[PDB]
Amino acid sequence: SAATREALITGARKLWGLRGYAEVGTPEIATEAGVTRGAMYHQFADKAALFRDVVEVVEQDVMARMATLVAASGAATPADAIRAAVDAWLEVSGDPEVRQLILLDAPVVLGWAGFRDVAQRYSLGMTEQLITEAIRAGQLARQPVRPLAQVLIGALDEAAMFIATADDPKRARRETRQVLRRLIDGMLNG
Template sequence: MQVKSGRRSNAERTRAMRDRLVATARALFVAQGYAETSTPALVTAAGVTRGALYHHFADKRALFRAVVEAEAEAVAQAIEAADDRAESALDRLLAGADAYLTAMAEPGRTRLLLVEAPAVLGEAERRCIEDTRGDATLREGLEAAIEAGALRPLPVAVLAPILSAAFERAAESMAAGAEPAACRTVVRALIAGLTGRGDT
């Protein structure tokens, strides 16, 4: 019988180190902002050498991009987790909107994704990151709701980014202190307005 070794593989060690660097960087970027977070501060906080940092990431910007990707993926997963295939297409769209706002309420996430990311990476690169994550889920939800007759047949290529921008502004309002319930009510009313039947 072969005994499984307790030693981690190179791939596992690499993943653990990347996760450690990303988690450390996230905390510092949230607390201090990207511009005020130095590379020496990153390696000191992570307890690694400068060489270890550059082995995994080309520079601070590449590490920041990894943080943004991880945050965007967490939001997308939260939306997917809220998706109940037994519900109607419209109910699933509403649940996804609620899940987005809940996920964005994670401390620091709105700042990272909606403030720091456009400034550091540029809006085009930020949108590229979102395109295969939360934005893709939103497009699919809109297409399903339109196909089911729950929403007016509007062009999704135009509707999705406009609705996404509204969701982002709601998240920013919540981060600035707006009442979460009020933000959710407004977002749900926006979606209800697309049905042509009033409130849902």
């Protein structure tokens, strides 16, 4: 029964990751997972409920992938951590599964308040941390931490959205990386 939950989340994630939420129904997901409809409905009341669990697991991977990329950059100071964290977010949001589930389907399926809540639960803390360390190292002016975090989250979230729907994604990704790079470098002292 625990196994059944795991296999449904895994199946939904794969199939919705490839074709999108709208294009795959719960009966197809049950078959893919090797379970009956009643085992499925015991675990998930409806389609949208299974999607919420898919979003939690994909967000966990996004944060863990991002912490791996920052730690693999060899960033020696808070300011370099920030430069790495910015590049990592554009790399990870470019992953076509993350693009489909988080950038396109999650806002539609969860609603505005739902999506914003999830996005903030996963991103706010990390962002607030990086800012607090830069302030302490003297690489960023002493200022209020949450307001800056929140403004940066809206900038980065919009960046990713703009890439995901662009005519030329590879170009939008590159140009938008320059723009965020210049912005950060205007704020940072080193």
